[PDB]
């Protein structure tokens, strides 16, 4: 089965309040395992999963240093972006970075990531070839040309193919007890009175892992969505996830509606009724 290592890094400028906020979090699949928070009591790379408390000081010391390096460069980037777009020095802006790797069941690189955002919009992204860049605007075109000339792609690729994949395999060994699990969703349909003409059927999905799931309602074998309400997947808090989808249906014909659940842990997909 495939696995992913991902880091989500956020910098938020706040002039008149002080230095920019900087936070990095790491994930293995849908499981967080590390964090760095500039606003914490003692800012450092620290474990966020019990199986990471194994690693010694040489891990966290080196990780903390790398984070603080990026913190400084994220500060410059924020300033540079403000210059690029001719924005006011007084306003608060965001700079985001996501990177990591996807590996296949054969323990090899499937896809590497190195992409950036300004104020929640795409800025620049390392393409799937890990050689070329996609720039979202003409400002990012300036960045792209600078990073092309600097040879950044080969530098990132070196990490993505080597360091990223190897340490991911290490994490999958450290947390082999919990990370390699696959909890199929326990699903059901709930009845809730609405009007005197119709009723609400809420299809539930509980306690599943990973978080990737598919929930749909189909009437008489066809399909329905444009009326369907679908909340985004939510963490239960115990490492599992929840999700539901509801439909408004007239009285008496509830059993002509089928909820369909697709998930990694379900060999045969689920078909449910009230």
């Amino acid at each position: 089965g495939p696995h992913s290592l991902r880091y989500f890094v956020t910098a938020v400028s706040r002039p008149g309040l002080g230095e920019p906020r900087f936070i990095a979090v790491g994930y293995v699949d849908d499981t967080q395992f590390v964090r760095f928070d500039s606003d914490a009591d003692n800012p450092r790379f620290e474990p966020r999963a019990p199986w990471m408390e194994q690693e010694g000081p040489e891990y966290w010391e080196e990780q903390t240093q790398r984070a603080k390096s990026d913190e400084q460069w994220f500060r410059v980037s924020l300033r540079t972006a403000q210059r690029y777009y001719n924005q006011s020095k007084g306003g608060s802006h965001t700079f985001q970075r996501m990177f990591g790797c996807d590996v296949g069941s054969d323990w090899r690189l499937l896809r590497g990531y190195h992409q950036f955002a300004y104020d929640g919009r795409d800025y620049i992204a390392l393409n799937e070839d890990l050689k070329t860049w996609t720039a979202a605007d003409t400002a990012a075109l300036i960045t792209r040309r600078k990073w092309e000339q600097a040879g950044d792609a080969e530098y990132y690729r070196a990490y993505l193919e080597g360091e990223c994949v190897e340490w991911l395999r290490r994490y999958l060994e450290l947390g082999n007890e919990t990370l390699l699990r696959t909890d199929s969703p326990k699903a059901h349909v709930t009845y809730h009175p609405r009007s005197q003409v119709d009723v609400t059927l809420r299809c539930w999905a509980l306690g599943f892992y990973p978080a990737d799931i598919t929930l749909t309602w189909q009437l008489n074998g066809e399909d329905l969505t444009q009326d369907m309400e679908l909340v985004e997947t939510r963490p239960a808090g115990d490492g599992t996830f929840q999700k539901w989808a509801a439909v408004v249906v007239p009285l008496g014909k509830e059993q002509n509606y089928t909820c369909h659940v697709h998930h990694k842990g379900l060999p045969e997909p689920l078909t449910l009724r009230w």
Binding site: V34, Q63, R66, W73, V76, K146, Y156, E163
Partner: peptide
């Protein structure tokens, strides 16, 4: 493992 960016945008 965390990896750094080498410079600004």
């Amino acid at each position: 493992y965390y990896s750094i960016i080498p410079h600004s945008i």
